[PDB]
């Protein structure tokens, strides 16, 4: 807040420091429902769901074997299955992998085969290093999510990230009451009048936190001139 906030509002800053999306939950009086909804928006890396990742070489075949934990999935209540992790691994474009290579062994094992003078070993090591950093669930731009219990006792899910549309499209979140302090995100999702309201509200909040007592008509003029 303060002068840096005014600076990053009055210019069309694509990336701001600490953006917050304040989702209003449909079930606002249940810790279990709130944390289940958090499990839908908070990103969960493959490192958080897998017991181990290993490189296995055989007589003529080489593959990455990943063994995941269904117990942690059930304890955190992620609506996630094995094929979800398979398609999430396939969708990773930086990994350079395809659905023809990913195979399911048992109920917990995922095998990623690598096929071909020494490129097989380099690709194998690169894939092993980059695999436990893929996102199998959650939004790709959300850093973290916290359930906040307000003074009224109702619970709001406030997150750090840039996916307003994906948060307000997520089940369990009322999309008609979800707001963001970032203004170009609101402009991209909702339109130009919502961006104007976001400018006015954010500038007014920044001024009122320091108690400077600026008349809101000047803020409205600035918001209209910007948009």
């Amino acid at each position: 807040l303060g002068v840096p906030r005014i600076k990053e509002i009055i210019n069309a800053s694509k990336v701001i420091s600490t953006p917050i999306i304040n989702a209003v939950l449909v079930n606002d009086n249940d810790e279990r429902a709130a944390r289940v909804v958090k499990g839908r928006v908070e990103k969960t890396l493959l490192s958080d769901v897998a017991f181990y990742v290993q490189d296995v070489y055989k007589d003529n075949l080489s593959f990455i074997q990943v063994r995941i934990d269904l117990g942690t999935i059930d304890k955190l209540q992620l609506e996630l299955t094995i094929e979800d992790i398979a398609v999430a691994i396939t969708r990773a474009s930086k990994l350079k992998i395809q659905a023809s290579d990913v195979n399911i062994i048992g109920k917990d094992r995922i095998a990623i085969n690598v096929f071909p003078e020494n490129d097989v070993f380099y690709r194998m090591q690169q894939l092993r290093r980059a695999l436990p950093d893929v996102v199998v669930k959650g939004l790709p731009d959300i850093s973290r999510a916290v359930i906040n219990i307000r003074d009224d006792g109702k619970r709001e899910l406030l997150v750090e990230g840039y996916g307003l549309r994906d948060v307000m499209c997520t089940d369990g979140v009322i999309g008609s009451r979800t707001t963001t302090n970032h203004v170009l995100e609101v402009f991209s999702v909702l339109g130009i009048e919502a961006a104007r309201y976001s400018i006015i509200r954010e500038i007014n909040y920044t001024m009122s936190n320091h108690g400077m007592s600026v008349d809101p008509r000047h803020i409205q003029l600035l918001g209209d001139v910007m948009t």
Binding site: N118, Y122, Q125, R129
Partner: protein, 700 residues
């Protein structure tokens, strides 16, 4: 302490060390001039002196400083050098050869005002209360301000969280050569970059060009037994396989294929790579044989620090830490300037000699000294302008500093006293908060907590404390032999696998070896320091996080005396104090008996200092001599400053230098460009000990 070490005498000590000792080192760096025309010709400098002929019994006559002030002259003493040169068919040596004039600093050992009584000062029209420490150039009195720099010959690790990259930089500084080397992280990979090398070299290749030829040894040096460090560093081992570099010669080829260094002699690419590894990658570490163990270990521990920084960002080095910073005084800066001036003089002299010897008629060597004078003034002016203009532009070292020297302020006695002991910060464009402008807790007792101006220079320029000492360089080879005799394993006979299983020893930032018992080694070294077998300014401190013991010997370190506490009792008793007050037992002999000792910031880190004698617990290691040392000379004028607010103390540190009052005892014999004097000055009722120690009550 202020009778011997003082608060102004850092400038005096630095200038005395430069004139008496450092000039000989600069001469020995560049002693030989050889003509390309004639192989037999050589001219060598074997000794250098300032203001004193070897034949003369006494110092030569110099104009008094007041006469130089009035006549707009320069207060200087001639530079005499002993030159042995080949003439004709025989070598002839000439003493007392004048090659310039060094502008001497007032009240140094080369000055007329040295250890002179008040009657002599009245005869020479100089005030006895003048602090000294300035140069009279063209009548203007100029002061070389102290400079903050990052610590030389040390590894500084920094990280950019918003950019994701980390880097360990070393600023190698030696009288032979100066350079800067970086070990950076890009794309999860570790590279080594230098100004001479055109492109970044992978760390496995540069480690293979040194004595190491196996990847397991590289991993054991960089990582050791930690699985996380191995997982982070295993990427760089594959680059030696990808580029098909597997021998020392191949790595030297790869390094020397992309070096931008241009040399007089044509060099083989393998030889060029050897030269780049030996004398360009790390300048302060040089090799004279086929062994590359010290260079390899230095680069390996740089990479280890980078890996530790990548594992967690909290293992980076604080750039604002006072222990990570060194103070350049007048002596070091004049040495660095005179190195460039003497190199230019030698090059011009060699060019003139080569020009004359191209003529075949001059069979005789024509007494080549007869041609010094046309170039000799090129030194003198090159000194004077560099103090007069204040611009320090040295293209050899890529230095473009501006504002080193300042005109000596004569608005008050305290203004002149306080402009000396000002420290100029390195980064003068930093507009961010909690950077160089923040008051670090590390400067407690080292730098003033209240003396800083308000405005665009707030927090950058700062002042020294009352009781501080700035270290001068000491010899490291006796300390190296003392390390070897005390039980430190040599670096050339230890395992690379078990290097990190025991504490390492670092002499001036260079890994000298490994020690089995670090605490006993530290205790024995401290005992030798307190007894007097080594210099009192050698700093020993053990860092458990790095698993190292560090021995600092070089200059530029800020120090502070403290009373030693052993077994929960202060080592200074009442008998010592009454002997000190009686007249004997001066501060040097407190140092010799081991009652007090000098601690720098890094040694203060491994210490537990008690402010008062009533607060001593038996875990204490040191006792404060006196607390108000944490306030400087100007901040000492403030009465009861601990009952005030800090901004008011800062504002009055600013406004004390603008007070109109008496200037000096010869203020009516002086002709200055602007002088404000008070008709009826009075000393304050509410004094301070600092006022009495700096003699502010004599000239209020």
């Amino acid at each position: 302490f202020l009778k011997v070490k003082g608060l102004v005498k850092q400038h005096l000590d630095s200038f005395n060390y430069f004139v008496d000792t450092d000039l000989k080192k600069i001469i020995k760096a560049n002693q030989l001039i050889l003509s390309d025309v004639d192989p037999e010709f050589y001219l060598k400098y074997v000794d250098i002196r300032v203001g004193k002929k070897s034949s003369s019994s006494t110092k030569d006559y110099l104009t008094p400083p007041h006469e130089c002030r009035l006549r707009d002259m320069t207060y200087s003493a001639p530079i005499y050098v002993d030159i042995e040169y080949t003439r004709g068919r025989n070598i002839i040596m000439h003493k007392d050869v004048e090659i310039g004039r060094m502008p001497i600093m007032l009240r140094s050992n080369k000055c007329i005002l040295y250890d002179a009584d008040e009657s002599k000062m009245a005869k020479l029209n100089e005030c006895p209360l003048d602090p000294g420490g300035y140069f009279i150039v063209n009548g203007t009195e100029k002061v070389i301000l102290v400079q903050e720099q990052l610590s030389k010959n040390r590894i500084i690790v920094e990280a950019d969280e918003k950019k994701g990259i980390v880097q360990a930089s070393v600023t190698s500084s030696t009288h032979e050569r100066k350079s800067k080397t970086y070990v950076i992280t890009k794309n999860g990979k570790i590279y080594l970059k230098h100004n001479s090398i055109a492109e970044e070299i992978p760390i496995a290749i540069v480690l293979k060009a040194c004595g190491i030829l196996s990847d397991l040894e590289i991993m054991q040096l960089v990582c050791g037994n930690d699985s996380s460090y191995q997982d982070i560093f295993a990427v760089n081992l594959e680059e030696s396989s990808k580029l098909d570099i597997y021998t020392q010669q191949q790595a030297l080829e790869y390094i020397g294929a992309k070096v931008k260094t241009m040399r007089r002699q044509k060099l083989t690419i393998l030889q060029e790579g050897i030269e780049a590894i030996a004398t360009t990658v790390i300048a302060h570490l040089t090799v004279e044989a086929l062994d590359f163990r010290e260079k390899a270990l230095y680069i390996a521990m740089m990479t280890r620090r980078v890996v530790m920084a990548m594992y967690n960002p909290k293992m980076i080095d604080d750039r604002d830490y006072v222990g990570n910073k060194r103070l350049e005084l007048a002596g070091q800066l004049i040495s660095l300037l005179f190195e460039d001036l003497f190199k230019k003089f030698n090059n011009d002299f060699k060019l003139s000699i080569d020009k004359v010897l191209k003529k075949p008629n001059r069979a005789m060597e024509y007494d080549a000294l007869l041609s010094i004078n046309v170039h000799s003034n090129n030194i003198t002016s090159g000194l004077n302008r560099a103090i007069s203009t204040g611009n320090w532009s040295l293209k050899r070292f890529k230095m473009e500093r501006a504002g080193v020297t300042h005109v000596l302020s004569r608005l008050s006695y305290i203004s002149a006293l306080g402009m000396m002991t000002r420290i100029s910060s390195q980064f003068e464009k930093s507009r961010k908060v909690s950077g160089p402008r923040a008051l670090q807790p590390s400067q407690f007792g080292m730098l003033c907590t209240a003396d800083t101006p308000e405005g665009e220079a707030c927090g950058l320029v700062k002042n020294l404390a009352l009781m501080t000492h700035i270290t001068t360089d000491d010899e490291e080879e006796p300390i190296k032999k003392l390390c070897y005799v005390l039980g430190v394993e040599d670096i050339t006979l230890i395992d690379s696998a078990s290097l990190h299983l025991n504490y390492g020893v670092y002499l001036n930032g260079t890994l000298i070896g490994s020690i089995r018992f670090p605490t006993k080694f530290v205790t024995q070294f401290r005992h030798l320091r307190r007894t007097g077998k080594v210099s009192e300014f050698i700093s020993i401190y053990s860092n458990s996080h790095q698993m190292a013991v560090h021995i600092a010997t070089d200059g530029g370190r800020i120090c502070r005396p403290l009373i030693i506490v052993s077994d929960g009792q202060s080592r200074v008793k009442d008998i010592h104090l009454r002997k000190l007050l009686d007249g004997e037992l001066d501060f040097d002999d407190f140092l010799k008996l081991g009652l007090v000792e000098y601690l720098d910031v890094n040694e203060e880190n491994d210490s537990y200092i008690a402010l008062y004698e009533k607060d001593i617990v038996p875990s204490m290691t040191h006792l404060e001599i006196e607390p108000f040392t944490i306030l400087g000379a100007v901040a000492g004028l403030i009465p009861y400053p601990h009952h005030n607010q800090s901004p008011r103390n800062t504002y009055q540190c600013a406004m004390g230098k603008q007070a109109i009052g008496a200037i000096a005892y010869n203020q009516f014999k002086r002709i200055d460009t602007l002088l404000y004097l008070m008709t009826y000055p009075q000393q304050p009722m509410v004094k301070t000990k600092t006022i009495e120690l700096i003699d502010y009550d004599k000239l209020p």
